[PDB]
Amino acid sequence: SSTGLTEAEAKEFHAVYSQSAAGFLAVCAVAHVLAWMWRPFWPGAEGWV
Amino acid sequence: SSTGLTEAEAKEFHAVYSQSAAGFLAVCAVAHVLAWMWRPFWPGAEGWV
Amino acid sequence: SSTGLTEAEAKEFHAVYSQSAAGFLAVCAVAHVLAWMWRPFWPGAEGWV
Amino acid sequence: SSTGLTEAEAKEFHAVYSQSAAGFLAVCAVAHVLAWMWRPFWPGAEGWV
Amino acid sequence: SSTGLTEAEAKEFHAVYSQSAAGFLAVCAVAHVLAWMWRPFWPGAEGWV
Amino acid sequence: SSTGLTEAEAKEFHAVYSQSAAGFLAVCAVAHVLAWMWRPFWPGAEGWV
Amino acid sequence: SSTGLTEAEAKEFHAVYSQSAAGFLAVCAVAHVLAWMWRPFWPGAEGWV
Amino acid sequence: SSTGLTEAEAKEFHAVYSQSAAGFLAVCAVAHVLAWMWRPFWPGAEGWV
Amino acid sequence: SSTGLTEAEAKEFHAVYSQSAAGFLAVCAVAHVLAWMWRPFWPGAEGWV
Amino acid sequence: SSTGLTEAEAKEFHAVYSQSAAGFLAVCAVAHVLAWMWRPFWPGAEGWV
Amino acid sequence: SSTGLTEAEAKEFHAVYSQSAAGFLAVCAVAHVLAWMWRPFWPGAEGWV
Amino acid sequence: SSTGLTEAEAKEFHAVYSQSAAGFLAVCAVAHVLAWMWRPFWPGAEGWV
Amino acid sequence: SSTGLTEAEAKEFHAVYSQSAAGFLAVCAVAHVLAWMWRPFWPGAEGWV
Amino acid sequence: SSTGLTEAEAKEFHAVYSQSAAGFLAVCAVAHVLAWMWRPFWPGAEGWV
Amino acid sequence: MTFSTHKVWLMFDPRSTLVALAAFLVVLALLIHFLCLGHDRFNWLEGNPAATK
Amino acid sequence: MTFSTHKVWLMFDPRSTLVALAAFLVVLALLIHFLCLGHDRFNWLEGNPAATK
Amino acid sequence: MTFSTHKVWLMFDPRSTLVALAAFLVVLALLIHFLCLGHDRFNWLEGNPAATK
Amino acid sequence: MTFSTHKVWLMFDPRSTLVALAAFLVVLALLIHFLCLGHDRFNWLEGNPAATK
Amino acid sequence: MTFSTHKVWLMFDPRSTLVALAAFLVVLALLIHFLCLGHDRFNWLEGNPAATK
Amino acid sequence: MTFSTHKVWLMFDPRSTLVALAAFLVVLALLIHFLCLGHDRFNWLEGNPAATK
Amino acid sequence: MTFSTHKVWLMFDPRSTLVALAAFLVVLALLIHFLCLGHDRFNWLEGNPAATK
Amino acid sequence: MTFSTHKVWLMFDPRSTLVALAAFLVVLALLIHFLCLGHDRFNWLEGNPAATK
Amino acid sequence: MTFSTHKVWLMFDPRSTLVALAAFLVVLALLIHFLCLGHDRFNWLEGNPAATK
Amino acid sequence: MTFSTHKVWLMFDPRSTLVALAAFLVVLALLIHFLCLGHDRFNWLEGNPAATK
Amino acid sequence: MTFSTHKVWLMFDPRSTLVALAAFLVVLALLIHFLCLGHDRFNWLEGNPAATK
Amino acid sequence: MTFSTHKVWLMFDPRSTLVALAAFLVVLALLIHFLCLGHDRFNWLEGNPAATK
Amino acid sequence: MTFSTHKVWLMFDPRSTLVALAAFLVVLALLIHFLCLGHDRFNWLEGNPAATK
Amino acid sequence: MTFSTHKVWLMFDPRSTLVALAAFLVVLALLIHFLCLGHDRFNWLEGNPAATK
């Protein structure tokens, strides 16, 4: 369309892009779980005590 | 019209855009419920006491 | 005329615009009533006492 | 003339403009009456005492 | 002349302009009378006492 | 000449200009007399005492 | 010459200019005499005592 | 495609690039293990005590 | 020559210029004599005592 | 290719470049060994004591 | 030559230039003699005492 | 090649350049030996004591 | 050559240039001898005592 | 070559340049000997004592 | 300008005049509100007592 | 503008008018929110007691 | 300029003259109001007692 | 804009509108998070006790 | 320049001369008013007693 | 964008979109890491004890 | 210039010369008045006693 | 990118991509080293004792 | 330039030379007057007694 | 880049690559030397005793 | 340049050389006068006693 | 570059390379001399005693 | 340059060389005079006693 | 460059090389003289005693 790609080329690029984005989000989720196990980042009513 | 799209293309784009906007607002609503359950953000007459 | 629109297109755009503006103003009015119930914002002769 | 409008077009635009201006001035007059009833804004010889 | 108007157009424009200027000056005169009645603005030899 | 005006136009413009300048100077003279009668503005040897 | 004026035009312009300059200098001289009669502006050996 | 390279050229460049990236990451991983054995960089609840 | 004037024109311009410069210098000499009679401006060995 | 060089010229340039880079790295390694023997730069738990 | 002048014009200009420069230097020399007779400006070993 | 030189001109220029660089390095080496003999610039464990 | 002068013109310019430079240097040398007799400008081991 | 000079012209220019450079270096060497004789500029272990 | 002077729009472009008038009115309203906020008696948000003297 | 003035879009371009109106409304909302934040009684995040005097 | 000098608009363009005069008058009005606000007696918002000495 | 106004994309370009909306939403989210971080109660990283008064 | 020198308008353009004269006269009037305001005796708004010494 | 919206690359150029996304993600990651470094509890390099209150 | 040097205007353009002379005279008058105002004896607005020593 | 996505270089120019990647990696390495130097425990040149608390 | 060097105006343009000379003379006169004003003895406005030592 | 990748010069221009590499290496060497000079233990010219703690 | 080097004006333009020389001589004279004014002994306006030590 | 790599001048222009090398060498020499002057032990002009600790 | 090197003017333009040499010599003379003025012993205007130590 | 390398002027323009060399040598000489003046021992104008320790 406005880009030079076709639907097939867009489909395969989107497959690779989706796999890459899912991997990035999975690594970020694992990183956040690790960070929480290090120091939880949502304080209770009394703060960081 | 002035964008080059047809009504059918505009309709399918609007369907995707509407779904995405509804999902974003739903996530924001859940986030605001969570933030309120963490610390409510409308103070009473005596403030944060 | 000077915008390229016809009266028919101007009329339907104005219908959508009028509905959107009325909805925005209704939400703003509800928000102002809520903000007043939270904390009224017109002080009496003695101020915020 | 120098704007491209006709005298009839100028007449109808001026009718709408005059109505809108009168409405704006009326709302401002009501707002000024309300503001005066809240806190009058012309002090006497002793000031705001 | 140098402007695109003719004498007939200039005369009627000047009629409207003269009426508007006279009205503006009358309002300003009334406003200055009111301001003087509020607080006179030419001090005597002893100042504002 | 170098302005495009003729002597006839220059004479009547100068008539209006001269009347307006004389009126401005007369108003300024009256204003200066009034300001002097308010507070004279040439001090004597001892100053503003 | 290099200004486009004729000697006849230059002569009358210079007549008007000379009269205007002489009048300006005469007014300035009267003003300086008046200022001196107000406060002389050349101090003696002891200054303004 | 849009770079002028062929798929075979892209394939050999990617082979070299992948080997270089893997080597860089392996050196970085060894470096991070060494840095951790020098001074671990995730503090416990008591900090660096 | 390089200015477009003639030696005849240069001679009369120089006559006027020389008269004007001599007058300016004469006025300056008189002014300096007056200034010296007011307050001499070359101090002796002890200064302005 | 995109540089104008051929594989043979690229090969001999890479031979010289590789020799020079290896020499630079060897000199840097010797310099680092010397600097360590001067003052080691990885502190222990007690620091520079 | 490169200025457009001839040697005859250059010599005639140089005569006036040399006379003017000699006069300027003579006035400067008389001025420096006068300034020295006012206050000599080369201090001895003890300074201005 | 890309500089316009031939291999013979490049070779003779490189002969001169190599001689000049070797002389510069020899002078720098002698200067560094002299500077070390003046004040050695690698401190021991106790510093400059 | 690259300046447009001939050797004959260069020689006769250089004669005057050499004379002027020698005169300037001679005046500077006399001035330096005079300045040294005023106050020598190379301090001994004890400074300006 | 790239400057437009011939080798014969380069030879004589380099002869003059070399003589001038040698004279400059000789004057600088004599000046440095003189400066050393005034105040030597390489301090011993105790500094300028 | 009055109700009867409809011919002013043969001289002033209605669109540009409307835009300029809106800009001027918004700026004036902001300035007046800020002036009220800048004084003790009329800063309704600060809520000082009305008698500031 | 009212409900019956649909011909204003024969004078104002709907797209540019919508963009300018959105920009103005966002700026106005930000200004008013910041004004509330800048005063003790109406700064809901600071949570002062309502009676500031 | 008086009531009888209608021919002034054959020399000055009415629209640009009106715009320039409106700008000058607004700036002058703002200046005079600000000068009143800058003095104790005539700052009606501050409301000092009229006798200020 | 609603679920039924699909014709808005015949006057607004989807790509530029999407980019502008993403930029606006990101800037708004950053501003709101920074406002939360700028107050004691809602700076979750600083972790003050919820009752700041 | 007097009542009899109408030919000065064959040399000076009346419109530009009027504009420049108005600008100069307004600037001079503002300067003199500001000078009066800058001194104790002649600042009518401040209203000092006339005998400032 | 979801797993099924592959047609979004007919509207957005994949190379420029990838470059802009990489820039945005790197900047956001740096911002969040700097915010963590800016608070006592979550500056892992500084290593304050977790209970900062 | 004198009363007899009328041919000076065959060299200097009368209109530009008049404008430059007016500008110079106004600037000089302002400078001299400001110098009078900058000294105690001759600041007529300040009205110091004449004997300032 | 992965080991199998060689067709990424049909979209990204290898030379400019390599230059940009090298610049980014060098800047990131400098930033991280400077962050280590900016903290007491991890400034190996300063050589503080590891237990900074 | 003397009384006999009338030919100097074949080299220097009389109008530009006169303008530059007038500018230089005005600037020099102002400088000398300001220097006199800058010293106690010769500031005639300030009127210090002549014996300043 | 390794000993076997001579084809990298069919992509990178040797002259510009050499110039950029030399500039980067010189800047990196200067930075590291300045970092050594910026710390007590490794400033060889200042010559502090090695045990700075 | 001497009394006999009249051919120097076949190389230097007399008008530009004269203007440059006038500017240089004026600037030098001002600099020297200012240096005299900058020292106690030779500031003839200040009129210090000649023996400043 | 070594004694045997004479073909380096078929790639680098000898004149520009020489000028750039001279500039770099002069700047480096100045920098190193200034660094010596910036330390007590190696500022030969200041001449501190060699044992600065 | 020596007495016998007249061919230097076939390479250097005499007029521009003379101007540059005059500028350099004037700047050098000013610098040296100011250096003398900046030191107690050699400031002849200040007239300190020669033995400054 | 040595005595035998006369062919260096087929590569370097003698006039521009001479000008650049003169500029560099003058700047270097000024720098070295200023460095000497910047230290007590070698400021011959200041004339400190040679033993500054």
Ligand code: BCL
């Ligand atoms: C989320 C899916 C739909 C959507 C569904 C609806 C529905 C249903 C309604 C609106 C209404 C409105 N929408 Mg909408 N709206 C969408 C996207 C937008 C976008 C945008 C650029 O993305 C904008 C600027 C708007 C703007 C607006 C307001 C001008 C208008 C008035 C009420 C209001 O919310 O005022 C306050 C303005 C704001 C708070 C900012 C506006 C931004 C958000 C996105 C507005 C959506 C609000 C809407 C009520 C949410 C309901 C959707 C639910 C998932 C069912 N919408 C998409 C296309 N929208 C209402 C209306 O027309 O009034 C009569 C209405 O009933």
Ligand code: BCL
């Ligand atoms: C909300 C749906 C309609 C609308 C419905 C009406 C109705 C009904 C009226 C007006 C009137 C006015 N409208 Mg409206 N108005 C709309 C959008 C606008 C826009 C705009 C750029 O979108 C502007 C500048 C205006 C401007 C104006 C004023 C100039 C005018 C004077 C009274 C007033 O409110 O002054 C104060 C100015 C402000 C407070 C600034 C804000 C302007 C707001 C947006 C206008 C809405 C005010 C209106 C009274 C609300 C009633 C609508 C209800 C939903 C039923 N309207 C849309 C098209 N409008 C009145 C009129 O013509 O006077 C005789 C009137 O009776």
Ligand code: BCL
């Ligand atoms: C509101 C509907 C009408 C309107 C109705 C009238 C009527 C009726 C009169 C005027 C008069 C005037 N109008 Mg009007 N006027 C309108 C819009 C304007 C606009 C504008 C750009 O919108 C401007 C600059 C003016 C300017 C002016 C003044 C020059 C003039 C003198 C009064 C005055 O100075 O009061 C001080 C106020 C100002 C300087 C601010 C000016 C702006 C406002 C909008 C002026 C309106 C005047 C006043 C409120 C009259 C409205 C009463 C109606 C019954 C609602 N009008 C619209 C078109 N106007 C009077 C006149 O001509 O004198 C002989 C007069 O009798």
Ligand code: BCL
């Ligand atoms: C007011 C109506 C007339 C006018 C009527 C006269 C008359 C009559 C005389 C002058 C004279 C002069 N006018 Mg006039 N003058 C006018 C407008 C101007 C304007 C202008 C741009 O508008 C300028 C620059 C001048 C300038 C001048 C002076 C150069 C000149 C010398 C005396 C003087 O006042 O010096 C000081 C300069 C000033 C104080 C500032 C500007 C001068 C003011 C504007 C003119 C007033 C001067 C005059 C004495 C006023 C008397 C007019 C009465 C109403 C009868 N006039 C208009 C056209 N003018 C006199 C003359 O030529 O001397 C022989 C003279 O007799």
Ligand code: BCL
């Ligand atoms: C010195 C002579 C050779 C060279 C010989 C080798 C050999 C052998 C190897 C590499 C490897 C690598 N080289 Mg190499 N390398 C050279 C010049 C370069 C240049 C350059 C612009 O000059 C760059 C950017 C690189 C980059 C790289 C890395 C991307 C890659 C991964 C390991 C690594 O060191 O990561 C860390 C990145 C850095 C430390 C940044 C510094 C870059 C330096 C110059 C990398 C060269 C170090 C290399 C390991 C030396 C090995 C010892 C040799 C026997 C002398 N080389 C020259 C052409 N290079 C390795 C590889 O491909 O992994 C599978 C590998 O086995």
Ligand code: BCL
């Ligand atoms: C006012 C009427 C006449 C005029 C009448 C005369 C007469 C008569 C004489 C001069 C003389 C001179 N005039 Mg004249 N002069 C006029 C306008 C000018 C203007 C100008 C741009 O307007 C300038 C720059 C001058 C400049 C000068 C001097 C260069 C010259 C030298 C004496 C002097 O005053 O030095 C000091 C310079 C100043 C104080 C500043 C210069 C500006 C003023 C305007 C000088 C003119 C003052 C003049 C002497 C006063 C006499 C006029 C009386 C009304 C009779 N005149 C007009 C055209 N002028 C004299 C002369 O030529 O010397 C032999 C002389 O006798």
Ligand code: BCL
């Ligand atoms: C003064 C007369 C000759 C000259 C005579 C010689 C002789 C003889 C030799 C050199 C050597 C060298 N010359 Mg040489 N040199 C000249 C002018 C220059 C110029 C210049 C732009 O004017 C430069 C940049 C150089 C540069 C250089 C060095 C790169 C080179 C290495 C040793 C060295 O001194 O390093 C240190 C660099 C410096 C101290 C700064 C460089 C500037 C000065 C002018 C270098 C000349 C020093 C030279 C040794 C003095 C001896 C000449 C005596 C009068 C006999 N020369 C002129 C043309 N030069 C030597 C060589 O080639 O090594 C194998 C060598 O034997």
Ligand code: BCL
């Ligand atoms: C003033 C009358 C003559 C003149 C008559 C002479 C005579 C006679 C001699 C010189 C000499 C010199 N002149 Mg000459 N000189 C003139 C104008 C100039 C101008 C100029 C642009 O106006 C310049 C830059 C010079 C420059 C110079 C020197 C470069 C040169 C060397 C000695 C010296 O004074 O060094 C120091 C540099 C300075 C002090 C800077 C100031 C330059 C001044 C203007 C030089 C004039 C000095 C001269 C001796 C005075 C003669 C006039 C007397 C009143 C009779 N002259 C005019 C044309 N000049 C001498 C010479 O050639 O050496 C062998 C020499 O014998």
Ligand code: BCL
């Ligand atoms: C004064 C009349 C002659 C002149 C007569 C001589 C004579 C004779 C000699 C030189 C020599 C030199 N001249 Mg010479 N020189 C002149 C003008 C110049 C100009 C110039 C732009 O005008 C420059 C840059 C130079 C430069 C130089 C040096 C590069 C060169 C080396 C010795 C030296 O003085 O180093 C130090 C550099 C300086 C102090 C900077 C100032 C340069 C001054 C102006 C040069 C005059 C040198 C000296 C004072 C004159 C007598 C020299 C003695 C016989 C030693 N000359 C004119 C053309 N020059 C000598 C030489 O070639 O060495 C083998 C040499 O024997």
